[PDB]
Amino acid sequence: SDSLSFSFINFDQDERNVIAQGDARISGNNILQLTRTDSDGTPVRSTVGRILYSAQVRLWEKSTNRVANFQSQFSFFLESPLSNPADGIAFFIAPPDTAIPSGSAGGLLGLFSPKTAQNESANQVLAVEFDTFYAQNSNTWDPNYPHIGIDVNSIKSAKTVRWERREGVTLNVLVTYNPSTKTLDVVATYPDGQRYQISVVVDVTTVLPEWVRVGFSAASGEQFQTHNLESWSFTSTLLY
Amino acid sequence: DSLSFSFINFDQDERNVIAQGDARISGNNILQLTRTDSDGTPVRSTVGRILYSAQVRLWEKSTNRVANFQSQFSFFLESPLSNPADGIAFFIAPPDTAIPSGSAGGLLGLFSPKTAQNESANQVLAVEFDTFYAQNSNTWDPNYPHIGIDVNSIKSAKTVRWERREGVTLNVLVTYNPSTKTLDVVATYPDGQRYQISVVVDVTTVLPEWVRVGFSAASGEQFQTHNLESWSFTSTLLYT
Numbered sequence: 271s272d273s274l275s276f277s278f279i280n281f282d283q284d285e286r287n288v289i290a291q292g293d294a295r296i297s298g299n300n301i302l303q304l305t306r307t308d309s310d311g312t313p314v315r316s317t318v319g320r321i322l323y324s325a326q327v328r329l330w331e332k333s334t335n336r337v338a339n340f341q342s343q344f345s346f347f348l349e350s351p352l353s354n355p356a357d358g359i360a361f362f363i364a365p366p367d368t369a370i371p372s373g374s375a376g377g378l379l380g381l382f383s384p385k386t387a388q389n390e391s392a393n394q395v396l397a398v399e400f401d402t403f404y405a406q407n408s409n410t411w412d413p414n415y416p417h418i419g420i421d422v423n424s425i426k427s428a429k430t431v432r433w434e435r436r437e438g439v440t441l442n443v444l445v446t447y448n449p450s451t452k453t454l455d456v457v458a459t460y461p462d463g464q465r466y467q468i469s470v471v472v473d474v475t476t477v478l479p480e481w482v483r484v485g486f487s488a489a490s491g492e493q494f495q496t497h498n499l500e501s502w503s504f505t506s507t508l509l510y
Numbered sequence: 511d512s513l514s515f516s517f518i519n520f521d522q523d524e525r526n527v528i529a530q531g532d533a534r535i536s537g538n539n540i541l542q543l544t545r546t547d548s549d550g551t552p553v554r555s556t557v558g559r560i561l562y563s564a565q566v567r568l569w570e571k572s573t574n575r576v577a578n579f580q581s582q583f584s585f586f587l588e589s590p591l592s593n594p595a596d597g598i599a600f601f602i603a604p605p606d607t608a609i610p611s612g613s614a615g616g617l618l619g620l621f622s623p624k625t626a627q628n629e630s631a632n633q634v635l636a637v638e639f640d641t642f643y644a645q646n647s648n649t650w651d652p653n654y655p656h657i658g659i660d661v662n663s664i665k666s667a668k669t670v671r672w673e674r675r676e677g678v679t680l681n682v683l684v685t686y687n688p689s690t691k692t693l694d695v696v697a698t699y700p701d702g703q704r705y706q707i708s709v710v711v712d713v714t715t716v717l718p719e720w721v722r723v724g725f726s727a728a729s730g731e732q733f734q735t736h737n738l739e740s741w742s743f744t745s746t747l748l749y750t
């Protein structure tokens with residue numbers, strides 16, 4: 271597999287190329303609802319939901335030293351009745367058999383396990399998070415404000431940019447990886463043009479195995495919010 | 511909504527290919543569809559096929575959408591025979607398509623003998639590169655080597671005369687334009703010799719909404735290797 275690209279303008283309830291994990295569901299409105307809701311559609315506590323595209327991505331090839339670029343465009347919105355809505359949605363890359371880690375329903379966003387969430391040598395996850403909950407005595411790894419973060423085998427982001435949550439408002443996001451500069455880029459924009467940028471230098475060949483899957487994860491612990499992905503398009507090309 | 515992938519060559523640890531029958535990846539990273547012996551010599555009575563694992567949304571009734579697609583591939587054939595058989599085809603079929611019974615020969619791994627010329631029993635769209643045409647056996651063929659477009663029948667809706675070139679790679683582009691409902695084929699040899707064949711066909715009447723795409727080849731009493739060097743594919747669903 272030298273390249274893979276796909277696009278979801280919206281989500282089909284009869285979608286064939288998605289792996290749904292945990293509470294992830296596609297609504298009759300063609301929205302992917304990651305975290306669980308009750309019978310009235312209200313977000314609930316202690317829920318994790320993830321999707322992965324079924325086709326695997328060859329992110330790099332050790333035997334010829336090729337490394338893939340990639341680009342992921344998506345838009346999402348969050349809804350909650352709470353003052354401190356939690357926990358956040360993330361675009362992430364992980365090994366093809368990745369499953370929801372134990373104890374990940376909360377600040378670990380469905381991506382990490384508590385005893386190893388800050389130990390990079392125990393993880394294989396590259397993620398772009400949209401973190402809404404940052405209480406310093408529980409989400410201790412976080413900056414003390416909502417943020418967009420790039421996670422490199424740790425729930426403690428290698429870099430963050432301050433971010434404003436907007437109840438029910440769609441955020442459009444472009445994540446790009448340039449192999450030649452080993453730069454992972456993140457641009458996020460609200461409908462009014464309000465923008466957020468963040469980037470890090472990361473060598474994916476030391477962070478992830480050669481074959482990966484790509485997708486999204488969201489979680490709520492004691493505090494909750496819905497995490498609604500509306501669209502997603504991805505592209506990756508393996509290059510010398 | 512859309513999908514694209516490419517194989518510059520074939521990885522022996524591929525994850526997104528469904529192989530059927532005798533298809534395998536060689537040490538040169540070539541997809542060898544039909545069976546070969548231990549010296550790489552073609553053998554009788556063999557079918558091999560591959561399908562990309564991710565399913566293609568070829569059309570959607572409820573939104574009156576039909577997808578375009580393009581398939582770019584290079585293959586070469588080798589045989590010691592003066593009448594080498596039977597051919598390779600790019601094809602599209604329902605997602606659970608399996609090698610039909612009796613299809614190791616002129617049916618190209620695509621059709622079953624009883625139903626091979628009965629469009630009412632088949633769900634196959636294919637572009638075939640047919641090297642064997644003996645009129646008392648492959649009665650459905652024209653009496654010469656040919657490239658043909660097959661619509662639910664081994665009897666091509668249209669063919670163009672073609673020349674087989676031993677061991678030479680043929681470059682093929684197949685495109686489907688849903689606004690003109692035209693499937694066309696441009697095949698080119700390295701010296702520039704070109705072949706053109708096209709058919710007005712409405713995919714919504716020949717194939718289900720969800721399909722898989724790939725290749726098939728076969729040999730019956732006569733034989734040849736059917737070697738796929740590369741394949742790139744893209745498909746986008748558009749309003750019609």
Ligand SMILES: CO[C@H]1O[C@H](CO)[C@@H](O)[C@H](O[C@H]2O[C@H](CO)[C@@H](O)[C@H](O)[C@@H]2O)[C@@H]1O
Nearest residue numbers: 356375376377378403405408490491492493
């Ligand atoms: C109001 O709940 C906060 O305080 C509780 C007790 O001090 C914590 O248990 C709780 O943490 C859990 O929920 C948060 C928010 O969903 C989550 O980030 C964390 O991982 C725990 O699951 C929260 O801090």
Ligand SMILES: CO[C@H]1O[C@H](CO)[C@@H](O)[C@H](O[C@H]2O[C@H](CO)[C@@H](O)[C@H](O)[C@@H]2O)[C@@H]1O
Nearest residue numbers: 595596614615616617644647729730731732
């Ligand atoms: C030399 O074999 C030819 O004549 C034989 C006797 O009539 C046929 O059996 C034979 O047909 C089978 O092989 C061909 C070539 O591989 C294939 O096209 C056909 O489907 C049969 O499997 C061939 O015509």
Ligand SMILES: *[C@@H]1O[C@H](CO)[C@@H](O)[C@H](O)[C@H]1NC(C)=O
Nearest residue numbers: 385386388389390391392393
């Ligand atoms: C980090 O994880 C590694 C194994 O992946 C382990 O050997 C090490 O003890 C861990 N370090 C800490 C501080 O937990």
Ligand SMILES: *[C@@H]1O[C@H](CO)[C@@H](O)[C@H](O)[C@H]1NC(C)=O
Nearest residue numbers: 624625627628629630631632
């Ligand atoms: C053609 O196929 C259809 C559907 O399988 C079947 O009903 C019909 O009897 C066939 N006609 C023939 C055998 O010519």
Ligand SMILES: [Ca+2]
Nearest residue numbers: 377401403409
């Ligand atoms: Ca957090």
Ligand SMILES: [Ca+2]
Nearest residue numbers: 640642643648
């Ligand atoms: Ca034939």
Ligand SMILES: [Mn+2]
Nearest residue numbers: 401412419427
């Ligand atoms: Mn964070």
Ligand SMILES: [Mn+2]
Nearest residue numbers: 638640651658
């Ligand atoms: Mn033919």
